[PDB]
């Protein structure tokens, strides 16, 4: 896959609604790398059109005529431009073809959204940490490591891989370099099916291609 160029304020402005469906991401954007794993993971890289954008110099267009909330991602697709990382990768995981990354058993599907719901404290935390108000990120990992523990049908969060393991990469890609740099903090240590995790993630092709850039 070739990945397109950056679009700037002095970019022109793609096709709105001409019946191609793309993704609207910055290449750095934790968010949008949700929603970007996703079309890698189910293989549509040649129906998802990606649409970068430089959110420093980004262009007027945009907010105008693709997504007046003017946040990264979005998704253009059957003449309606959706936003929310979480709800887009359900969205795309249920509306377009490639493998099921959400399992049937209700008893997971509960467990997701227990987890679905974490998300947004788990970044608290971590952020919390980074900028010194409080010290929780170890009590983050520690959720994160427990959760783990609760299916043994496999490595990831409920067993197989699904979404809810998409939805924590970006933020683990970032907070785990950052807490040992900045706290000489290692999330693994004492933590094994946290470092199983990782590892099984980084075998995953899809998701490592979005780490890549052009
Ligand atoms: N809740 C949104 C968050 C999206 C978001 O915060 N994206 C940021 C980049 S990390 C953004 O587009 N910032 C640009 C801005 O706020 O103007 C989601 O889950 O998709």
Same mark, same amino acid.
């Given at each position: 896959? $070739?990945?397109?160029? $950056? ?156 979404? $809810? ?50």
């Amino acid at each position: 896959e $070739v990945l397109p160029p $950056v679009l700037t304020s002095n970019s022109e402005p793609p096709p709105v609604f001409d019946g191609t469906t793309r993704l609207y991401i910055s290449y750095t954007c934790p968010y949008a790398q949700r929603v970007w794993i996703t079309r890698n993971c189910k293989g549509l890289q040649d129906k998802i059109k990606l649409v970068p954008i430089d959110l420093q110099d980004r262009p007027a267009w945009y907010k105008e005529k693709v997504y007046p909330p003017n946040k990264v991602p979005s998704l253009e697709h059957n003449n309606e431009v959706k936003g929310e990382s979480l709800d887009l990768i359900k969205y795309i995981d249920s509306h377009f073809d490639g493998p099921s990354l959400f399992p049937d058993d209700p008893a997971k599907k509960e467990f997701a959204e227990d987890l679905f719901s974490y998300t947004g404290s788990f970044s608290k935390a971590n952020n919390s940490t980074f900028k010194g108000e409080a010290d929780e990120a170890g009590a983050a990992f520690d959720y994160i490591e427990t959760a783990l523990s609760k299916f043994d049908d496999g490595p990831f969060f409920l067993g197989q891989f699904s979404l $809810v393991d998409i939805a924590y990469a970006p933020f683990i890609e970032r907070f785990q370099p950052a807490l040992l740099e900045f706290k000489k903090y290692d999330i693994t240590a004492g933590r094994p099916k946290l470092a199983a995790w990782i590892e099984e993630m980084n075998k995953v092709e899809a998701y490592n291609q979005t780490r890549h850039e052009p």
